[PDB]
């Protein structure tokens, strides 16, 4: 194809309350962050980006990242920003992916990529609000490149000073994993 579509995951979060990498959680009989590329290996990805932080030895030592470009570092302003670098040329957009909700749909994926580049940004309605994944057109990548402060992807999504459109999913909000119990949830679906 002429244009490709790009998936990036973000993965580089820390681990701070639970004394192990949250990525190498085990889920359904692979990694927490393994289901979640898996997800994204099946959704029709031209490249796939992920980017990795204090955990990106422990999880290139488990995990194999074949077909994958891995950018690690030291809404996630500067892992995002060296994400675009490894963006292909003929990439249109990117759609952006969180490590630690491997719950994501491969349909969810498939439906975002049909639709998402005729939009500027597209994010997902759930039944409980606004989630992953999202897509970002290339004509705002010079913006997320200067994302700053908390929730710079989130303010992004919910800014009016773009078109964001809107693609319904079913269930809820993907769960995010930061604590014990967020993940006995996880492991409850």
């Given at each position: 194809t002429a244009t490709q579509i790009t998936g990036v995951v973000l993965a580089?979060?820390?681990?701070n309350r639970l004394g192990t990498p949250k990525q190498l959680l085990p889920y359904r009989d692979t990694t927490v962050l393994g289901a979640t590329l898996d997800v994204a290996r099946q959704a029709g990805f031209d490249q796939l980006i992920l980017t990795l932080g204090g955990a990106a030895s422990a999880v290139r030592a488990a995990m194999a990242l074949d077909g994958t470009d891995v950018v690690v570092v030291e809404g996630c302003a500067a892992s995002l920003r060296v994400a675009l670098a490894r963006v292909?040329?003929?990439?249109?957009g990117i759609v952006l992916m969180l490590g630690?909700?491997?719950?994501?749909?491969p349909a969810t994926l498939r439906r975002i990529i049909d639709v998402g580049p005729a939009t500027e940004i597209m994010v997902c309605r759930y039944a409980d609000g606004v989630g992953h994944p999202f897509w970002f057109s290339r004509t705002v990548f010079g913006e997320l490149a200067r994302l700053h402060g908390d929730k710079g992807v989130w303010k992004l999504v919910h800014s009016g000073r773009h078109p964001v459109r809107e693609l319904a999913v079913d269930g809820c909000v993907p769960l995010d994993v930061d604590t014990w119990d967020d993940y006995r949830r996880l492991l409850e679906s």
């Open positions: 580089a979060g820390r681990s292909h040329p003929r990439a249109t630690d909700q491997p719950q994501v749909a």
